[PDB]
């Protein structure tokens, strides 16, 4: 009881957000909550760039240049290098192709709709209370109740589109 | 069991419809559209239908110098359309707006590609139209076919 | 013209040539191998073997589906409009769903081809199915897509409008 | 070029289904007496001796190749595990049979996506089969 | 085109309220086990394909900018308000 | 828009039970297409029979509540033939 | 002096921004001022999207979707079809 | 294939500069006794008879081709208008001379950009020149 | 720096100015190749300048760029680290 | 400055980025006529090439060979 025990995933990468004390027990999720944490973190930074959109701190042509692969450092534009968090966006708009193309499309939906309907959002993967995956996975918004086994992954064929009975 | 599935019956319908090809231009009996077009042209009354060579009803159907609307494949009126003057545009290859909705619902589906990958039919593009099997049909030696492909899909159906 | 069993048009020369082709269709080793795979089609995708011929004759135009995050742009009524953009490239499409090949420009937006290009690229492709020296009329036109003011064919050069009909004289 | 006319003369007999593959050049691990098509087929990336020497992509390729030969030895067709059930094969790409005709002569390339090519060495198997077959007799 | 029936026997109810105004509360309903994904791939669509100009918009435009003539006991009479 | 042959008869029975005020225990239950549903009965739903698409009652199929299947136009004509109304083919 | 005479460039395209009266003389630039007018119009709409950036009327991810070739009509997002000038940017 | 060995045997003499062009297939206006390389060269898109029958791109191509032959007839090199001034040619792409060696044998393709290709019909001018030249003598 | 983006594609570069061919992915950002790929694609290219059958050591590795844990050469298979040196024994 | 010529070359792209509009001049803003005469047209290929590895020909010796001769 004098050592600092954090916990990692496979291949030793730390789930950052904590650091253990010498006299604590680190909570460590497994295999379903990470896929719920990242969706919570995706909705989190969806709500981040709708706040900076409301706050009017960045130009409207800023995301166009990051899309086109043009990177302006803060040394170029006269302003101090860290006085805005400028390099936040260029990181989280270049995380992936399919990632950032949804993160903009979710935010422009969530900007106008909050400024004004449908009770639909993204899909949060529901888990059990143990921590594993619930074997049935329903997506409200479409009607797809499919099934997922073994630390994630759609088992093929088991898709159900708008039926009365739950897919056992 | 009965006279139907006997080979004496199915030769007779093949000998019937092969004569009906050089007589009527169809390798089939006339459907409901073509009978209603003939009995309207015979007695000369208005509302002659329109048949687009497939046996089904042509979609937009106008009557003589009057109102116009569009019809499904059964002979009944579409209620959201009666346009005097120009003919309407009912689903005439307008399948983008239905297909636009499938892309937007795929756009708004969570994140990270956990399932969104798994959301022409399967095993047809890589067995029939690519693997030398359709190439005997829509191909030949020269232009002297004019082989209608609502006759070959009637040829395999009736035979 | 001709009237058949009902109010039908009978090009009997067209009908006799189809049944000569239909007898030659059945006298093939590769139709029996087409018919073997037509049995192995499921019932929901094709009810009858004519519905097998419905899907196969339609699947010859189905290019493989694009990237999953692509969304097309339709018109006011919905008519699958001309310039069709994605991540960097835009292109131009027909009314049906496919794209015109070679029109995939990079950045900005392409110009959809005028009445010239879809007339001459047909007859450039039809030129490729001719005997040697056997030319035929290819409408040559400017870089802006508008016609060259004097088209030529068969050692005769005539002036044109912006549409295609030869103005007389 | 023998293996084409081995297949094409066998396929014009029209007595059974004819299928053809072709392995690509696989540069790595040339320390084996077996070569790049049998090792993908007879379970070699899973062997206890060959533990860790393969990736998780050559290994996962060499399970859809084992499913190809298994569905052939069970039913004479590498798309259907039985000769009486014809549901859609949802494990890999559907293998098309070797149609012995121009516009056909299909085969399978044992790469990561398992694509359907069309015509193997048709330039060079017209050389040894059509040019020389007129030079040897005349 | 696919056919989605949206009514039943319990879709409409009436009753005289103020002795010359026969009210009616039409209740369209449609089961979700009738509408495929290839028809309407979103619950937002089934909102807008019902409230839109095809069904609800056409019906409001019928009773507002038009006429509606019921036929009972050989007596034809109008039947429209907006409320 | 005008009224189908079902909803012609469903109004004609019901006002005859309103003008004469004597109730009749049958009213049709046609679908959206206008033609009759094959199964037909009254509100109490005790004897539901199959009917022809033209309108006449198919004689014989008066079950006690729910037909599992209704005969179609061949099997009616194929069986009435076997009873003997002409045309032995 | 009763006809409306505007003026165009080559191939007959109107320099929009005016319409002549029956009793006026239309000013028509030539060959250098158009290349100065378009630069003035370029700085003009440069100053337009810096005003809407100050006004906070559009999301920051709006220009990312137009870059990636994704076009959201105003019918999709619930809002009235012309209540912002949405299709200006695209 | 004669015009290659016409150039390459002439270039190994090393007595003068050797240059080679090759016109592409130009589908349009096949109503002329001249063909697709002379008309780009001897001023044919500017003729009073052929007014309007050419674009502003085939015409503007056929001025940089006239500059090619002019700088050759003036100085024996289609990059320099004189034989004593060697400033950089800023009108089109710099023509490289036909180097009669493997890794060379350059030419010019008369298209819209005027690019430098490398090796014309080297498959087929090895057929008539190396295969048959062993078949004819043996 | 390594990942070098433009309108839709990004790619990966050396220190000098040119780009690594084949690394021009579309959308997102590529992974610059590890110590494996620039070692084996040299010796795959050097394999193309060998006599037939005359193999030489090509370091085969995973899709993530990390080495396969047991490399092999000259009918001898040895285990490796994540760097390249053979650990003894 | 050990091959660190990007930051100088970054400034040339930014000054080309901020140059007006419309491409009136900005098109016209390895040296010319060298890429398409020497290194492509078979003339450099006798130098950095040979029969096998047995050269180790230093190219601060060949550019000293043509200089002194
Ligand atoms: C933006 O922030 C203001 C407060 O500054 C708040 O009143 C408003 O609700 C927020 N959202 C929108 C969409 O304006
Ligand atoms: C309408 O149908 C339902 C279901 O069969 C039935 O319960 C109801 O009584 C019917 N309505 C009337 C007015 O009979
Ligand atoms: C229908 O409308 C009336 C009048 O507004 C209302 O009183 C009633 O609650 C509504 N619903 C039903 C089920 O009748
Ligand atoms: C019943 O009502 C009908 C309504 O049309 C009427 O014609 C008839 O005279 C009435 N009485 C009898 C006895 O049918």
Coordinates of N, CA and C in Angstrom, one line a residue, chain A residues 30-111:
Chain A
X30 N -14.2 -2.5 -18.8 CA -13.8 -3.5 -19.7 C -14.8 -3.8 -20.9
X31 N -14.3 -3.6 -22.1 CA -14.8 -4.2 -23.3 C -16.2 -3.6 -23.8
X32 N -16.9 -2.9 -23.0 CA -18.2 -2.4 -23.4 C -18.3 -0.9 -23.0
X33 N -17.7 -0.6 -21.9 CA -17.8 0.8 -21.3 C -16.9 1.7 -22.0
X34 N -15.7 1.3 -22.5 CA -14.9 2.1 -23.4 C -15.6 2.5 -24.7
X35 N -16.3 1.5 -25.3 CA -17.2 1.8 -26.4 C -18.4 2.7 -26.0
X36 N -18.7 2.8 -24.7 CA -19.6 3.8 -24.3 C -19.0 5.1 -23.8
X37 N -17.7 5.0 -23.3 CA -17.0 6.2 -22.9 C -16.6 7.0 -24.1
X38 N -16.1 6.4 -25.2 CA -15.7 7.1 -26.4 C -16.9 7.8 -27.1
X39 N -18.1 7.2 -27.0 CA -19.3 7.8 -27.5 C -19.7 9.0 -26.6
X40 N -19.5 8.8 -25.3 CA -19.7 9.9 -24.4 C -18.7 11.0 -24.6
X41 N -17.5 10.6 -25.0 CA -16.5 11.6 -25.3 C -16.7 12.2 -26.7
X42 N -17.4 11.5 -27.6 CA -17.7 12.0 -28.9 C -18.8 13.0 -28.8
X43 N -19.9 12.8 -27.9 CA -20.9 13.7 -27.7 C -20.4 14.9 -26.9
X44 N -19.3 14.7 -26.1 CA -18.7 15.7 -25.3 C -18.0 16.8 -26.2
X45 N -17.2 16.3 -27.1 CA -16.6 17.3 -28.0 C -17.5 17.7 -29.2
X46 N -18.6 17.0 -29.4 CA -19.7 17.5 -30.2 C -20.2 18.8 -29.5
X47 N -20.4 18.7 -28.2 CA -20.9 19.8 -27.4 C -19.8 20.9 -27.2
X48 N -18.6 20.6 -27.4 CA -17.5 21.6 -27.3 C -17.5 22.5 -28.5
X49 N -17.6 22.0 -29.7 CA -17.5 22.9 -30.9 C -18.9 23.5 -31.2
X50 N -19.9 23.2 -30.5 CA -21.2 23.9 -30.5 C -21.1 25.1 -29.5
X51 N -20.3 25.0 -28.5 CA -20.1 26.1 -27.6 C -19.2 27.2 -28.1
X52 N -18.1 26.8 -28.7 CA -17.2 27.8 -29.4 C -17.9 28.3 -30.7
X53 N -18.9 27.6 -31.2 CA -19.7 28.2 -32.3 C -20.7 29.3 -31.7
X54 N -21.2 29.0 -30.5 CA -22.0 30.0 -29.9 C -21.1 31.2 -29.3
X55 N -19.9 30.9 -28.9 CA -19.1 31.9 -28.3 C -18.4 32.8 -29.3
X56 N -18.4 32.4 -30.6 CA -17.8 33.2 -31.7 C -16.4 33.6 -31.4
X57 N -15.6 32.5 -31.3 CA -14.1 32.7 -31.0 C -13.3 32.3 -32.2
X58 N -13.8 31.6 -33.2 CA -13.1 31.1 -34.4 C -13.8 31.5 -35.7
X59 N -13.1 31.7 -36.8 CA -13.8 32.1 -38.0 C -14.6 30.9 -38.6
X60 N -15.5 31.2 -39.5 CA -16.2 30.1 -40.2 C -15.4 29.4 -41.2
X61 N -14.4 30.1 -41.8 CA -13.5 29.5 -42.7 C -12.4 28.7 -42.1
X62 N -12.4 28.6 -40.8 CA -11.3 27.8 -40.1 C -11.3 26.4 -40.4
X63 N -12.5 25.7 -40.3 CA -12.6 24.3 -40.6 C -12.5 24.0 -42.1
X64 N -12.6 25.0 -43.0 CA -12.4 24.8 -44.4 C -11.0 24.6 -44.7
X65 N -10.1 25.3 -44.0 CA -8.7 25.2 -44.3 C -8.1 23.9 -43.7
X66 N -8.6 23.4 -42.6 CA -8.1 22.2 -42.0 C -8.6 21.0 -42.9
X67 N -9.8 21.2 -43.5 CA -10.3 20.2 -44.4 C -9.4 20.1 -45.7
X68 N -9.0 21.3 -46.2 CA -8.2 21.3 -47.4 C -6.7 21.1 -47.1
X69 N -6.3 20.8 -45.8 CA -5.0 20.5 -45.5 C -4.0 21.7 -45.4
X70 N -4.5 22.8 -45.0 CA -3.7 24.0 -44.8 C -3.7 24.3 -43.3
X71 N -2.5 24.4 -42.7 CA -2.3 24.5 -41.3 C -1.7 25.8 -41.0
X72 N -2.4 26.7 -40.3 CA -1.9 28.0 -39.9 C -1.5 28.0 -38.5
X73 N -0.2 28.1 -38.2 CA 0.3 28.2 -36.8 C 0.0 29.6 -36.3
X74 N -0.1 29.7 -35.0 CA -0.4 31.0 -34.4 C 0.8 32.0 -34.5
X75 N 2.0 31.6 -34.8 CA 3.1 32.5 -35.1 C 2.8 33.3 -36.4
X76 N 2.0 32.8 -37.3 CA 1.8 33.4 -38.6 C 0.8 34.6 -38.4
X77 N -0.2 34.5 -37.6 CA -1.3 35.4 -37.5 C -1.1 36.5 -36.4
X78 N 0.1 36.7 -35.9 CA 0.4 37.8 -35.0 C 0.1 37.5 -33.6
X79 N -1.0 36.7 -33.3 CA -1.5 36.5 -32.0 C -0.5 35.6 -31.2
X80 N -0.6 35.6 -29.9 CA 0.3 34.8 -29.1 C 0.1 33.3 -29.3
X81 N 1.1 32.4 -29.1 CA 1.0 31.0 -29.6 C 0.0 30.1 -29.0
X82 N -0.4 30.4 -27.7 CA -1.4 29.6 -27.0 C -2.5 30.4 -26.4
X83 N -2.7 31.6 -26.9 CA -3.7 32.5 -26.3 C -5.1 32.0 -26.6
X84 N -5.4 31.6 -27.8 CA -6.6 30.6 -28.0 C -6.1 29.2 -28.0
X85 N -7.0 28.2 -27.7 CA -6.6 26.8 -28.0 C -6.9 26.5 -29.4
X86 N -6.0 27.0 -30.3 CA -6.2 27.0 -31.7 C -5.9 25.5 -32.3
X87 N -4.9 24.9 -31.8 CA -4.5 23.5 -32.3 C -5.4 22.4 -31.7
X88 N -6.5 22.8 -30.9 CA -7.5 21.8 -30.6 C -8.2 21.3 -31.8
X89 N -8.7 22.2 -32.6 CA -9.6 21.8 -33.8 C -8.8 21.0 -34.8
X90 N -7.6 21.5 -35.2 CA -6.8 20.8 -36.2 C -6.4 19.4 -35.8
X91 N -6.3 19.1 -34.5 CA -6.2 17.7 -34.0 C -7.5 17.0 -34.2
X92 N -8.6 17.5 -33.7 CA -9.9 16.7 -33.7 C -10.7 17.0 -34.9
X93 N -10.1 17.6 -36.0 CA -10.7 17.5 -37.3 C -9.8 16.6 -38.2
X94 N -8.6 16.2 -37.8 CA -7.8 15.3 -38.5 C -7.6 14.0 -37.8
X95 N -8.5 13.6 -36.9 CA -8.4 12.3 -36.2 C -8.7 11.2 -37.2
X96 N -9.6 11.4 -38.1 CA -9.9 10.4 -39.1 C -10.8 11.0 -40.2
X97 N -11.0 10.2 -41.2 CA -11.9 10.7 -42.3 C -13.4 10.5 -41.9
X98 N -13.8 9.3 -41.5 CA -15.1 9.0 -41.1 C -15.5 9.6 -39.7
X99 N -14.5 10.0 -38.9 CA -14.7 10.5 -37.6 C -15.1 12.0 -37.7
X100 N -14.3 12.8 -38.3 CA -14.6 14.2 -38.3 C -15.7 14.6 -39.2
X101 N -16.0 13.8 -40.2 CA -17.1 14.1 -41.2 C -18.4 13.9 -40.5
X102 N -18.5 13.1 -39.4 CA -19.7 12.9 -38.6 C -19.7 14.0 -37.5
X103 N -18.5 14.3 -36.9 CA -18.5 15.2 -35.8 C -18.8 16.6 -36.2
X104 N -18.6 17.0 -37.5 CA -19.1 18.3 -38.0 C -20.6 18.1 -38.3
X105 N -21.0 17.0 -38.9 CA -22.4 16.8 -39.3 C -23.3 16.6 -38.1
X106 N -22.8 16.1 -36.9 CA -23.6 16.0 -35.7 C -23.7 17.4 -35.1
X107 N -22.6 18.2 -35.2 CA -22.6 19.5 -34.5 C -23.5 20.5 -35.2
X108 N -23.5 20.6 -36.5 CA -24.4 21.5 -37.3 C -25.8 21.1 -37.1
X109 N -26.1 19.8 -36.9 CA -27.5 19.4 -36.5 C -27.8 19.9 -35.1
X110 N -26.8 19.7 -34.2 CA -27.1 20.1 -32.8 C -27.0 21.6 -32.5
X111 N -26.5 22.4 -33.5 CA -26.5 23.8 -33.3 C -27.9 24.4 -33.6

